[PDB]
Each structure stands twice: as structure tokens, then as C-alpha cells.
From Swiss-Prot, chain A:
<protein>
    <recommendedName>
        <fullName>Major capsid protein L1</fullName>
    </recommendedName>
</protein>
<comment type="similarity">
    <text>Belongs to the papillomaviridae L1 protein family.</text>
</comment>
<comment type="subunit">
    <text>Self-assembles into homopentamers. The capsid has an icosahedral symmetry and consists of 72 capsomers, with each capsomer being a pentamer of L1. Interacts with the minor capsid protein L2; this interaction is necessary for viral genome encapsidation. Interacts with protein E2; this interaction enhances E2-dependent replication and transcription activation. Interacts with host KPNA2; this interaction mediates the nuclear localization of L1 capsomers. Interacts with host ITGA6. Interacts with host SDC1; this interaction promotes efficient infection of keratinocytes.</text>
</comment>
<comment type="function">
    <text>Forms an icosahedral capsid with a T=7 symmetry and a 50 nm diameter. The capsid is composed of 72 pentamers linked to each other by disulfide bonds and associated with L2 proteins. Binds to heparan sulfate proteoglycans on cell surface of basal layer keratinocytes to provide initial virion attachment. This binding mediates a conformational change in the virus capsid that facilitates efficient infection. The virion enters the host cell via endocytosis. During virus trafficking, L1 protein dissociates from the viral DNA and the genomic DNA is released to the host nucleus.</text>
</comment>
Swiss-Prot record, chain C:
<dbReference type="GO" id="GO:0042025">
    <property type="term" value="C:host cell nucleus"/>
</dbReference>
<dbReference type="GO" id="GO:0075509">
    <property type="term" value="P:endocytosis involved in viral entry into host cell"/>
</dbReference>
<dbReference type="Pfam" id="PF00500">
    <property type="entry name" value="Late_protein_L1"/>
</dbReference>
<dbReference type="InterPro" id="IPR036973">
    <property type="entry name" value="Capsid_L1_sf_Papillomavir"/>
</dbReference>
<dbReference type="GO" id="GO:0019062">
    <property type="term" value="P:virion attachment to host cell"/>
</dbReference>
<keyword id="KW-0426">Late protein</keyword>
<comment type="function">
    <text>Forms an icosahedral capsid with a T=7 symmetry and a 50 nm diameter. The capsid is composed of 72 pentamers linked to each other by disulfide bonds and associated with L2 proteins. Binds to heparan sulfate proteoglycans on cell surface of basal layer keratinocytes to provide initial virion attachment. This binding mediates a conformational change in the virus capsid that facilitates efficient infection. The virion enters the host cell via endocytosis. During virus trafficking, L1 protein dissociates from the viral DNA and the genomic DNA is released to the host nucleus.</text>
</comment>
<keyword id="KW-1161">Viral attachment to host cell</keyword>
<keyword id="KW-1162">Viral penetration into host cytoplasm</keyword>
Amino acid sequence: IKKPNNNKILVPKVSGLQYRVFRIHLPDPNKFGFPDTSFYNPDTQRLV
Amino acid sequence: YLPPVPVSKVVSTDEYVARTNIYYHAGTSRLLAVGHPYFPIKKPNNNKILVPKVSGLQYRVFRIHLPDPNKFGFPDTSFYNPDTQRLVWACVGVEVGRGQPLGVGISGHPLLNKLDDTENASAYAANAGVDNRECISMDYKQTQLCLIGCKPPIGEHWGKGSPCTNVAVNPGDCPPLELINTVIQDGDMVDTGFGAMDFTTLQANKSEVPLDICTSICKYPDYIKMVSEPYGDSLFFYLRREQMFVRHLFNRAGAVGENVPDDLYIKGSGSTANLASSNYFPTPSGSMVTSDAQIFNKPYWLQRAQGHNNGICWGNQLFVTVVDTTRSTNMSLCAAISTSETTYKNTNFKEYLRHGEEYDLQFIFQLCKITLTADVMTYIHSMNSTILEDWNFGLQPPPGGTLEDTYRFVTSQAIACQKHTPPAPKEDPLKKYTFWEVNLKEKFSADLDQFPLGRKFLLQAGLKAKPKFTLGKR
Amino acid sequence: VSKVVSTDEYVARTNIYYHAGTSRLLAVGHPYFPIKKPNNNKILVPKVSGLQYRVFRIHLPDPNKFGFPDTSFYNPDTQRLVWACVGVEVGRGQPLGVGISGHPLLNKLDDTENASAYAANAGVDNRECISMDYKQTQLCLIGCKPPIGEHWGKGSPCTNVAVNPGDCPPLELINTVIQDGDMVDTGFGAMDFTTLQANKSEVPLDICTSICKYPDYIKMVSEPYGDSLFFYLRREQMFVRHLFNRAGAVGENVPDDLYIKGSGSTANLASSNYFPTPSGSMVTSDAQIFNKPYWLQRAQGHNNGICWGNQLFVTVVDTTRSTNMSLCAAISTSETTYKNTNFKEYLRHGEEYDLQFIFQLCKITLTADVMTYIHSMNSTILEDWNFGLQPPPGGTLEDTYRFVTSQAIACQKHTPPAPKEDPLKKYTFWEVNLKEKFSADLDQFPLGRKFLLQAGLKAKPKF
Amino acid sequence: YIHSMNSTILEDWNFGLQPPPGGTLEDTYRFVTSQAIACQKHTPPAPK
């Protein structure tokens, strides 16, 4: 749905027939704080 | 239980806090500000602001935050269960960079209340006509100062009071005055040395002061009051420099509010039967600036402070405000409306007034923990209950049952948006106030040597563990 | 935030088991609408159909009042006793058959499945008498907190654009407690037609006024203690049948670029709106979820079958028995020539439920954490127990007697206000009392011995 | 092997120039705006 003169959408077109993509970010675990992190070195390695 | 009670032992922070062994740096480079010194520009019909009024005469607040102490990464954390111990950042050291060349600005008013110049006068004054007010500017008091703490700054200023009703309310009477303490907001006008008060309300003439200070309310911070904080958490440190001197000698022009009792002099005659305005006011003048006048651009180191707070940022929260008079020089330029004619036209060129601004934040930080006991924690409760919230204390009591919690679904919805467009739960108690913000939470580094400042921090206390590249001799 | 734990931590399981159960629950009523005296507001017949939801509230007497053959195994001071719900049954005796519903005026244009020519032009009030079958469904709900449903609904629009009559109202997602008598989805989705459908003819009678709702397993299971439901099962199915059109003024025209302009008969766009005809499928004896024992061991929530406040909930809904028997009475028995004027027609509907509940007995020790932890969870629970004190007051009172003696001492006693116990008293729904029916032996009951058989260890006297 | 697989991966780590030194060593961060006046910070395109 959009305003008849306008090009701007009034309502988004939605139906279950539409595909759905989901993008999910994670924060870099190499910035994180595990209750114990000493099990690794942040120099020679990283975490994924 | 033991100890958040009755007594007065007025806990000093550094006992319950423990200092970790690890440090960090983060920061933005810099910022800008430009603008017109005298007045802002908004769309004349609309309320939308095209250009603001900007000067070094504007106090600049600074508020930044750091993320959850319990979500953020350490090479060695073994020392804690975050449920056994809460955590906080600690502020060891701070730096104020200022990058623009140094020069003096100025401001004034096209109609200023003036009688005449009695600095040197060979003759008695004249009679006042209709609007003798003049166009004059003045050099503002040379100043630098610094304010940093975990709680917002507090200034003080005069304001018109509410006179007890005995004597009449009669117009022309002297309005009442009283002291006013208030939170300092960004964009406020720095007092020129004319006193912290409201020129708008208290001075009806409105021509008494230059445009910059004409409308608004200048304030000055009360250290006493602030340092009177028995926590000290207002600000845990500061320094200032200010200097000024006299330039010219003036007089007010207007009706005499309260006349001089004649017993103070001998009755004149002719011109001397009349009495010239008894009201003098000086012309304040800023002085020479020196390369020493910069108090900035040098690393500060704060170990112990007046309050009990030692550099602790509560609610993940930190405050800064600074004043520079040294860069006050405003850049001016013109726009030629007619680009053709070769003969000068005063009408041809539209002048403009702008100013530069530049800052730096390079922040040391230290890490700290809290052994978690209502033995203390309730004193935190006692101290401030706002930290009861974002912190969950790993518990409400040592058993610590959850809230039968609120988890909401709002994340995206049906075009309703009173599920908030309006403000969300909690609050900023300062939200009504207006002042500056930046997010630094992306700027941390697990290694120090990366940056210019830190090695001074290093070279300051030196280095125990000294980074080795196994390069050079083996 | 110190994070709720598994109830099987502090609770201890006892060695004793009990049973009680109702005689039965049957029903009679009219499926389509309730019956009332025409002038009066009082109901002559309550509206009843299988499509109506059913809620079951079951009290238990406080076991700490219930003397055991040997009571010595616990201290009533330091502890309490709480019932645990091991296993559950749902009896259904009706012969299995499908009901049905319709409406005499149904918004419709024409048949869209096959059209040999373009339709006619919309007149005034083309609604028709048409009926359909609702989706087949079976589900079961068990827990100590009321079942939480959800539905669509009208919310307050933004205030920017002025709403003209006939505008699209915004939509809202709304939870509420589930009330008995409420209606299953027909495949029209949970919402209030009454608000969002002015036509009132867009659906068959039964659901027209009410608000169909549906359980949201997420938010339900989202509970930290799971006490909404610790267990459930569900079965449902549907398929398409007919394809129709809404008949009425087009709310929003289709952008032309999505088609090519016609002419003549093709100049006018036929109604864009379609709605499906939902159709129940073949029922089977197999997929019946009832008349079979259940055995609870684990529950998604940390609550394991613990019924707080002597309180236990059952929500059961099925369409399988929806059969509506039709009957006819004769106003005049004389004439042998039949006349449709001679017979009045009536609709009544049967329902049949049954309940049999195992229960396990359970004790709780104390300490402070537990006390706290419960008092954290729901403090009202301790109220019905005897722990929480709460010192009593009182100094002095002046009785002045006597008052009807009309020499005036002040006017008087104002303190009824707290018989109030059920906070949900606003919520009406089906009620049953078991408190009398406990017994100490499974053996005498049909259901129980299975409990024995399952866990084995047939212990009985000698003869 | 990783750099073979997808090299852009190393970029987001601290990682990104050949055995361990560091850095993309031209100048990094800049911000020109505070209030609405003239060319906004978004007059240049978003580089990342």
C-alpha cells in the first residue's frame, strides 16, 4: 500500500508466501569476558 | 548485615574497592564546533535551527559510558566469579587535547547602556536624550578551567526572589534577589565577570550586556558546595586559571533608582545643581595569553582526591566539562552578492561570523571489583539506589530471586508506536537537562603501547612486564 | 537474578499416593446462541457447544490439615505438605461425531472456483444462508497458573491522520487470561470480529460476538517457573474447501500497473477480496488424545507437578464430539396431512467430561533462602500457610453501648472488605470441588492400578 | 589456508599484514559536524 500520488509506501507488502531471510550478527567473542579466559592467549590465537 | 547503619564512619571508597592489575585505553580523536558568537540562526518562520550561537563562552559538558563490567574481556579474569563479585571501571587518568591555534575573540552590543566616559572628563555631563545607547564590545576575562567527576556539575547564580508581602509591589521598586544553585547544562554562557544571575529578568533594560549574555543566564561553579559533597562524587578533581584587568570607566544612563543623600557632598549650582549619574561601571579586559596559559595538552595523574571516590565511575558513567578562552578568536568572512562590478560596494559583501572548536579525549582506565555483601552493598543501596537496578548484584539478597521478570515483546510492531516512540522505562534523571554525549564503548584496547598517551602512563610508573619482540639481541 | 532453580531441588518426594475424581461432567445447551426470555435479560438456556472452550478449576484441601494413618514422618512445625500431580486423565464418553455451524446472512459475491463469465454488479444486501465445518482440533493443558491466550485486536491508532469513517483501524497483539465459553479459531485467526467487523455477517453466528483466542506456547513456556503449564499436547488439521469473495465497497483499489485495464464488462474490477472455506477432515479413533493415561516425569519448566495454593488447572478443548442432535415437536397432533407449519424445531447439544487425578504427597523443609525464595516467587502462598508473622496490634476501643439506643455515638461498622480471596474472581469459568473425594487406595479404582502396573509392585492383602 | 578460503576474514580480526607486526597505519578517524549548518559528515559516502 502506498499513497496514490506518492511513491512512499503506506503499508508494507507482507504475506507468508514472501520468503524470509534472517541475518544475525554476533559480537566478536575476542572482545568478550568469559568467567575464566586464561585458557587461551589473545596473541597467537583468537576465538570463533 | 554488618556494616550499612546508622553510624558516622562515612565510608572511604578505597577500602571496599580492590584495584585490579590491568588497565585500558579508549577514546575518540576529536570534535568540532562552529557557529555564530552573538546569536543563533533558525528558520525565521519555523522553529528549526539553521545555525546556533557558538562560542568558547559556552560551557561544554561531556558524558560517556563504558559497557557492563561483567560482560567485558580480560586476558586473566580468574580472580572473580561475577556473581560473587561485581565490577567497575576506574578512572586513573585523563587528557584534554585542544588543537586550534590560540587567539582572542570578543563580543558586544549595538545598544549598550552608557552615560559617558568618566575615566577622563574635563566637563560636567549633559542631559540624556532618547536612546543614547551605543555600539561597543569588550574583551572577555582570560580563563581556563577543568571539571571531571561521576556526578554532573553544579553551578550557582543569582535570581529574582519572591518578596515578603508587607511593603507594596509598586513598579520601579528594587526586585528581590536570592542565590540559586542548579545543575550545569551544556551551552550555558560562561560568566564574563559580571556575576552569575539572569540579566533578562533582573535587568529590564536588556541593553546592559552584550548579545551573547543578553538573554541567557551565566553561572559559576561552587567548589565549596561541590566539594561539600561528603561523597565527593560530584567531581573528584579540578583546576582553573583566570585573570582580568580594568580598561575603561563608564556610567549608566537612566532614571535614578536611589538618589545620593546630599549630606555626602556640597550643593552645586547651574550645571552643578544637577547631579550626574552616580552609577559607574568598569570595562573589564582580558590580558595577554601565553604558551603557559594552556593548562591542557599535558597528562594528568590522579591518585587520591578530596572525596571518598577515587576515580570511580558509577553507573558506568563519567562526566567532563572544560572552558577555553584562548581560542576565542572567531573567523569572519564575506559573500559577494554581485560578483561582477569592479567598484567597491558596501552592499555587495555580506559578512559572516564563525568559530573553530577542537577537543581530544584520551582516557586511561582501571578495573575494579566489589566483594558482594549487603555488608556493603546495602550501603551502596544506602548510598544510591539507582545502582540497585542495572546491576542485579548477582542477587537481590544473597538468595537473590529474580523479578518474575518483565520480558517484553515490543521489538517491532503494527504501526502503533506508543509502545515506545515516547520515552522507555527507567529514566535519565538528567534527561530533562541538555548536554553532550558520545559512545566510546568500541574504543577499548587490550594492549597499551598502541597509543601515544599510554606509554607516558607507562614511562610514568615505568614497566614491570616489558613487551618483548625477540628482536635485536637474543 | 540469581536465577530460579529446578523445584526438584528443595522439594522432597514422599512414599504415599492418593486418588480422587469426580463422578463426571456432562452438558446440554444450544450451540449457536444462548436462550433468554425475550423481554428479560435472564438466560432461559445457557449457550453450550463443543466449540466453546472449557476451563477446569480444581481445589484441593490443604494436606497439612489431612491426618495421615501415621502422621509421624514429618514435623508440622518446621515444614508443610504440598500436593504433587503425577498423572492425569481425561474421560470422554460421547459417541464421536462432527457438528457444524453457519449463518443465514453471509457476505458473499459468487463462486470463484469456476466462472464461465464475468460476474454481475453488486446490489444491496446479497448476503446468503451458508454454513461450513470448523477445523478439527484436540489439545490439553495442565498447570497451576491459568492458561494464557492471545488474540488480535484494535489498538489506539497514532494521532496524525484524522480517521474518516471506513478507514482501516490498526491492529494489536493482546494477551489475556483464557475464559470459559470462549471460541476456538475457525481458521479466521484470534481477534475480535465485533470490533473490527462492523458487518457482523462475515462469520457464522457462534463466533460473531465472542473473541476467538489461541494459546501462545512461547510466552506461556516463557514463564520462569513454568507454572502456567508444565505439560500439554496438541493435534489439529485443516484443508481448503470453497473460494468466495467479500461483497461490498472496495476499501483500497489495486494499483492498475498490476494488471491491464479492461473495458465493457471488464471495465469494472470485481471484488478483490477472497476468503477460504475451512473444512474439517475425517476424524479417527486413533488420533484421540483422551481416554489414555499420562505419566508426568519431566516438565519444560522447573516446576515439577507442584500445585501451589492447593490449586491445579486443566484446560481441554475438542471438536470431535460436536454433534448437534436436532429434534422436533408438534403443535397440533391431529392432521394426517403434513404441514411445515406444524412443527417447531430446536437444537440442543451434549457434552461429556470426566476427571481422574493421581497425586503425590510432598514436604518442604525451610531455611531462610527457601522462605525468601518462595516469598520471592509468590508471597501469597505463605499466607495460606502459617509461617508469616506479622505481629498483631491493638490498644483500646470504645464501645459506648448501645447504639440503636439512638443517643448518638458515631455511625458504624465498616469492615467487611476481606472475604476477598480469589484475585481472578472477575474471571468466571467452570468449577468443581474434589475436596471430599480423596481415598487412600488406588486398587479400588480403575485408573490407579495402571499406576501400579506401570511402576509395578502389586501389594494387596491375602484371601 | 584461511587467507586462501576468504581473505576478508583476517581483516576483521586484529589480523591483516603477513607474520606478527600490526596496523593499517595511515590516519584513521575523523568527524566533521556537531549541529546542522553546512555539508554534513555524510556528504562523503560511507567508506565501510
